[PDB]
Structures are given as structure tokens and as C-alpha cells.
Write a structure and sequence with these properties.
The structure is cut from a larger assembly and holds 1 copy of chain A (193 residues) and 2 copies of chain B. Chain A is largely without helices or strands and 193 residues long. Chain A has helices spanning 26-29, 78-83. With 260 residues, chain B is low in regular secondary structure. Chain B starts with 9 loop residues before the first helix and ends in a 33-residue tail after the last helix. Classes of the chains: A little secondary structure (193), B little secondary structure (260). The PDB classes it as viral protein.
């Protein structure tokens, strides 16, 4: 319903999925081989069955496609400081989907307006899918030609012969904790001959 | 040999002890290990005063935070401060001569500055910069031929500014106009001498621009782009064929006799 | 990890780790939990080095059965005391300026006061 939807929910309409008693079929996506760049490190066949996180606490953040490989220790920036701090545990599966090619329409795509900057962060122990708008100027001119106003809605530049190097990437963090809580299933087994 | 008297202030000593997670004051460090230290963690920095840092000019990572000090004129004698990464508009006074010595900086960005007098000729001799920022600029007049030898313009970020006009014939030697957008702007003058040899152009940008109807200047180009009206679109939801309307006259096309 | 050249006091640290009778040695150490004691009760405690005590403010009264300790450093910036017991027979002077904040003192014992002269306004603020 989500990964195979044509009109994909945009970056400002993402949804958090609560997974309970459901075993994700990693052997399907991880072995799909549709994406050549599988820089996913952390999964092993001998430890695959024990990855039964009772409460999946996964965090998501946003970074530009060309800046994903520009991450080095001892460097800071406002993009990381405004959405979610990146620790030294950046090693993880890069769950990146290519939906840019599936959102092409006749007459140009001028309704897709991304929001790179958010007022606050995804606070722990709380859910927020609000659509608050932050303006870059105090006094509004409301489109009237004048001073002390700017436009935050950047043109997409969706030329038909434009470059394909603007593919976004997102990485999630999966850490296991053994708290005082029960469990019932951790993984199935394949029936023999 | 013992080294003491490092922290004159009593409260600053406790602040440094808490920030640098040093339990005691009798520890020993070496120069080579500190020089390799490219990460310093000083959370909850209660740095009220700057006295005592003058004797440590061999630090790679720094930390500065002051919400009351608006006179930072002490920066003239301060040689080792490179990490100036803060976002606050509470600084009303802007010190003069900040750029005279600040060449040892690694990263420094600044926005929403109240610089009333931007010095002319910043790009005179310092051509070693790779990533140049032209953020919140106010240069109203440019020297003639200031960008003559600077034929190395590859990365251009000119958005997010209060640019008003452009000089007559600024992009003359620049025959590689590749990617630029001109919205939310108040352009007054179009540069000349940029379409004389640019007859083999492959990218042209005309949207949201007040082309003059003065005959016989741009009549040929206007008619040619009008003949291909089936490709050009607009931002507002209005009848596209009616957009191409010259201002003032209102008479039909065939009834216009171009003088001279 | 054990670190050498840290503790000058052997007897004091030994009695601190012995009188409490802790559960075992494999426990951790800190400063807030260790410094919960504000009144030291150690017989014939002759701790002299009190320099840099600004990181340990919770102590108020210090007992010293040390007739040898004639250092004025014990009263240079120690103005949080409420009790006095010093066997310093050759006390011919009293430091000045310590009355700037001394308002929490209740009872003092000043025996062998050989001061044949007294200063002006010494008790003026002690309302």
C-alpha cells in the first residue's frame, strides 16, 4: 500500500507505521537486486532470526542526495542540528526508494513543494504529523513587489532532460534492547522436504 | 616542569572542569595527542568570560557562547578563534574590521547581518577560495574589469539576497550561462554584449521578465518565441494565450508601423 | 583504572573506605555520593592541604586536633563555619574581611585571647 503507491506521500506527508507481531520479509527487498547500490551493512544470515525487536523504535531524518557522502567526523551543520543529531553509529541499511520516476505528469510538476526545514524535531515519546509552516521573514509582503521579503518555495527545475543525480537517501537506526517485557514470536521456519 | 595558574577565575575553572569532564587539575597531556584531537565535547558551556584562553593557541576545536556580550571588539587580539557558528540576531552592533585577520578560519557562515558598509573589492587578491558565499550582500556598484582574470567561475550561488540592479555589461567574458533563476527579484537592467556572439546558445531564460516593445529591438525574438507558445507555461492559473500582450498600445499587430 | 600519584592522604582514604564497611570493591565511585558527609569525625585528623577547596562547598565545620597547623590558609576563604576549635597558642592576629558574609555562626569558643587591643566596628554588623 505504501511502497507500491503511484502518488507517493511526499516528505511532508510521511506516515509512521507501528509494527507488532509482524515479521518483515527482509529476504525479499534485500535480495530484490533492483537497486545496484546496496550499501546496507549490519544484517547477517546467522543473526537474522534474532532481529525480533519487541518495540521497534526507528528514527528518520532528511538529508540531500549530494551531501550523503560528505559526512565525516568532526563536522557540524544546521541540517543535522535542525532535524536529528547524527551520532557515530551512522552505519546501517540505506532504505532509499526511487519514486521520482513514478511521479511524472504531463504539463509539468509544479504542485510538489518540499519542506527542507522544520520548526522542531521528532520529539521522543510523542507523535506529531502536523503541517506547520515556517516563514523566513517577519513582515509579510504577500507577493507584492517590495523590500524585506523572499520566496521559500524554490522552483523544482523539472526539465525533461535534467540530470538524474538528485536521488534522495534515508538511513534508519535499529538497536536492540532487552527490557522487562514479554515476547511470543521472533521468526518463522521454512518447512523441510 | 609544573605548569599552574592556568585558570585565574574560580567559576571559569569549575565551568571548564565540568565541560571538559576533567575530574581533577593534576593531569598531564602532550602536544602531539592534542594536535590530533579534532573533536571537543563541552556541553552546557557556561562561557561568560574569555580571559585565560590567550595562552592556548594550539587548539583545533573551540566553543563560544555569549548572550549578553554585544561588544566583541576583543576579537582583534584573538588569533585562535575559528569556530564561530551561532544563530542569534540579538547582536545589534557589528564590529568593524572582522575580516582583516580572519584567515585561519575553517568554517564560518553568517546570515541576516546588519552590515551597513560592505567593503568594496573583497575579491581583489584572495582567489584561493573554493566555495564562495555571497550571502546577504549589498554591493550596489562594481569596479570595471574586476573579474577579468577570473575566468574560473564554475560554482555560482547568487540567490537569497537583496540584489537590485546589475552593471552594464557584467557577463561579457562569461559565455557559459548554465543554471540561473531570476525570481523574487527586482531586476532593472539586462546586461548588454551577452547575445552578440551567443548565437549557438542552447539554454535561454525569459520567464517573468519585462521585455520592452521598443521597435526594432527584440521584435524578432518575441515573435519567434510567440510562434512556439505551446511549450511556455506560467505560475499563475490564467489563460495562457492572453498572457502575450504588449503594454499600453492595445492596437492589433498588423496595424503597427515601426518608425525609423 | 588505577591511577598513581593522585591521593596524598593514606590514612584518611583508608579510614574512609574502612569505616563505612561497603558491600564489596567492585562498586563504582563518584564525588556527589562520596561527599555526602559534611561534618568529618576522624580522631586526630591532621589534613593540612585545603587549597583549591572551591570544588567542595558542602563542608561547614572542620575539626582539627593539629596544634602544628599554624597556616592562615585555613581561614583565608573558609567563611562557612559555625564552630571554632583551634589550639593555636601563638595567635597574635585575626584575619580581616572574613566578616563580609559570616551570618550562620551560632557558638564560638575563644580561649587564651591575648588581644590587649580591639579593632573598631568588629561586632558592628553582628546584629
Amino acid at each position: 500500500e505504501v511502497f507500491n503507491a503511484t502518488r507517493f506521500a511526499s516528505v511532508y506527508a510521511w506516515n509512521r507505521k507501528r509494527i507488532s507481531n509482524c515479521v518483515a520479509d527482509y529476504s525479499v527487498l534485500y535480495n530484490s537486486a533492483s537497486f545496484s547500490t546496496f550499501k546496507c551493512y549490519g544484517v547477517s544470515p546467522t543473526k537474522l532470526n534474532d532481529l525480533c525487536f519487541t518495540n521497534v523504535y526507528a528514527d528518520s531524518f532528511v538529508i540531500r542526495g549530494d551531501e550523503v557522502r560528505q559526512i565525516a567526523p568532526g563536522q557540524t551543520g544546521k541540517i543535522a542540528d535542525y532535524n536529528y543529531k547524527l551520532p557515530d553509529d551512522f552505519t546501517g541499511c540505506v532504505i532509499a526508494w526511487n519514486s521520482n520516476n513514478l511521479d511524472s505528469k504531463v504539463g509539468g510538476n509544479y504542485n510538489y513543494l518540499y519542506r527542507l526545514f522544520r520548526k522542531s524535531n521528532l520529539k521522543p515519546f510523542e507523535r506529531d504529523i502536523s503541517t506547520e509552516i515556517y516563514q523566513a521573514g517577519s513582515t509579510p509582503c504577500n507577493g507584492v513587489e517590495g523590500f524585506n521579503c523572499y520566496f521559500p518555495l524554490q522552483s523544482y527545475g523539472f526539465q525533461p532532460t535534467n540530470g538524474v543525480g538528485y536521488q534522495p537517501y534515508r538511513v534508519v537506526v535499529l538497536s536492540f534492547e532487552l527490557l522487562h517485557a514479554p515476547a511470543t514470536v521472533c521468526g518463522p521456519k521454512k518447512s523441510t522436504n | 616542569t609544573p605548569i599552574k595558574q592556568i585558570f585565574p577565575d574560580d567559576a571559569f575553572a569549575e565551568t571548564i572542569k565540568a565541560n571538559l569532564k576533567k575530574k581533577s587539575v593534576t593531569d598531564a597531556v602532550t602536544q602531539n595527542e592534542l594536535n590530533s584531537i579534532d573533536q571537543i565535547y563541552a556541553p552546557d558551556s557556561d562561557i561568560k568570560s574569555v580571559q585565560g584562553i590567550q595562552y592556548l593557541p594550539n587548539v583545533r576545536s573551540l566553543k563560544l557562547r555569549s548572550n549578553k556580550l554585544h561588544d566583541i571588539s576583543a576579537l582583534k587580539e584573538l588569533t585562535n578563534l575559528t569556530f564561530l557558528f551561532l544563530n542569534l540576531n540579538q547582536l545589534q552592533s557589528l564590529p568593524n574590521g572582522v575580516f582583516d585577520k580572519l584567515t585561519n578560519l575553517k568554517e564560518l557562515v553568517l546570515v541576516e547581518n546588519q552590515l551597513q558598509s560592505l567593503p568594496d573589492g573583497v575579491f581583489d587578491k584572495l582567489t584561493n577560495l573554493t566555495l564562495l558565499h555571497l550571502m546577504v550582500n549589498q554591493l550596489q556598484s562594481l569596479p570595471k574589469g574586476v573579474f577579468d582574470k577570473l575566468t574560473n567561475l564554475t560554482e555560482l550561488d547568487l540567490s537569497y539576497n537583496q540584489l537590485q540592479s546589475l552593471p552594464e555589461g557584467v557577463f561579457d567574458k562569461l559565455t557559459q550561462l548554465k543554471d540561473l533563476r531570476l525570481y523574487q527579484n527586482q531586476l532593472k537592467s539586462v546586461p548588454d554584449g551577452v547575445f552578440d556572439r551567443l548565437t549557438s546558445l542552447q539554454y535561454i531564460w525569459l520567464h517573468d521578465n519585462p521585455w520592452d516593445c521598443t521597435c526594432p529591438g527584440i521584435r524578432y525574438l518575441s515573435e519567434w518565441i510567440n510562434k512556439h507558445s505551446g511549450v511556455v507555461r506560467s505560475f499563475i492559473p490564467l489563460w495562457a494565450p492572453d498572457s502575450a500582450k504588449c503594454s499600453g498600445s492595445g492596437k492589433p499587430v498588423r496595424s503597427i508601423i515601426c518608425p525609423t
